[PDB]
Amino acid sequence: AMPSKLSRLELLPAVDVRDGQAVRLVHGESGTETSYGSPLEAALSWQRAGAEWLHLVDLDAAFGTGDNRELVRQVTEAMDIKVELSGGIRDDASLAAALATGCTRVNLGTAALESPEWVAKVIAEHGDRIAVGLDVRGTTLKGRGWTSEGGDLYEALERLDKEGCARYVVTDIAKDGTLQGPNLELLRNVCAATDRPVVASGGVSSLDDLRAIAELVPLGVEGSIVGKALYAKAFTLEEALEAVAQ
Numbered sequence: 434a435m436p437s438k439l440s441r442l443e444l445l446p447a448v449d450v451r452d453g454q455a456v457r458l459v460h461g462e463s464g465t466e467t468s469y470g471s472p473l474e475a476a477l478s479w480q481r482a483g484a485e486w487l488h489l490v491d492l493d494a495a496f497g498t499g500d501n502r503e504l505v506r507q508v509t510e511a512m513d514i515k516v517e518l519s520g521g522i523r524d525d526a527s528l529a530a531a532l533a534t535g536c537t538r539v540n541l542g543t544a545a546l547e548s549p550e551w552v553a554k555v556i557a558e559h560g561d562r563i564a565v566g567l568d569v570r571g572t573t574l575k576g577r578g579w580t581s582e583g584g585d586l587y588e589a590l591e592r593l594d595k596e597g598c599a600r601y602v603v604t605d606i607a608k609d610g611t612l613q614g615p616n617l618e619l620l621r622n623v624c625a626a627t628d629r630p631v632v633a634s635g636g637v638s639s640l641d642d643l644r645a646i647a648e649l650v651p652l653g654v655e656g657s658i659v660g661k662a663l664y665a666k667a668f669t670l671e672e673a674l675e676a677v678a679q
């Protein structure tokens with residue numbers, strides 16, 4: 434593989450919080466949670482292993498089953514590394530609270546489906562501290578913890594591009610928590626549709642899968658979120674970082 438000056442693929446280990454625990458689901462389905470203990474210990478583990486980013490989700494807030502605001506605040510404050518924070522960020526107050534944690538950026542999901550004028554305003558005011566999470570089954574967007582129906586993926590990308598959105602985080606729900614491998618086709622198709630950076634999520638199962646996503650960096654894929662493969666020890670984060678470096 435020929436040398437290049439392009440950046441390497443960024444890795445964002447996930448810490449998804451439900452009922453006070455770091456959890457992994459299958460297709461994000463409520464009730465399929467596997468718990469891996471405290472979110473703080475999980476986050477600090479990834480930081481010790483050399484993580485540059487943490488992808489931190491309050492899943493109770495996404496589902497609407499209470500929240501974990503104090504814990505995700507504490508985790509964010511403990512990180513020296515960059516933190517991408519999401520879950521429940523759907524109006525001015527929840528956005529203000531999220532930003533006050535000192536996270537590096539937030540992801541908006543449901544609000545891009547239910548409150549597009551508000552998302553447009555937030556993008557215009559906050560720039561690259563905002564990314565939109567586009568979570569699909571096929572090309573159909575889903576909200577509210579993936580329990581609600583949104584529209585077509587590409588319609589949304591076209592609108593959000595025009596509104597000046599900086600970055601998209603794209604999950605294939607059918608791959609998430611499955612260790613089936615990532616949907617590379619989805620990533621290539623999204624990169625064909627937008628010139629903004631794209632962060633992949635869902636299905637990574639192996640170092641070879643990360644290498645495959647890394648090949649798409651020159652198409653526009655900036656990073657990869659990894660959950661179950663790290664928690665289930667398919668590989669270490671040290672190994673994953675070396676795999677995408679070189």
Ligand SMILES: NC(=O)c1ncn([C@@H]2O[C@H](COP(=O)(O)O)[C@@H](O)[C@H]2O)c1N
Pocket residue numbers: 449458460461462463490492494495496519520521522523540541542543544566568576577578579604
């Ligand atoms: N069911 C799930 O696993 C799930 N549901 C939502 N999410 C994440 O929650 C966040 C969106 O929350 P909201 O829709 O409240 O903005 C995004 O990061 C999105 O990927 C999940 N990981």
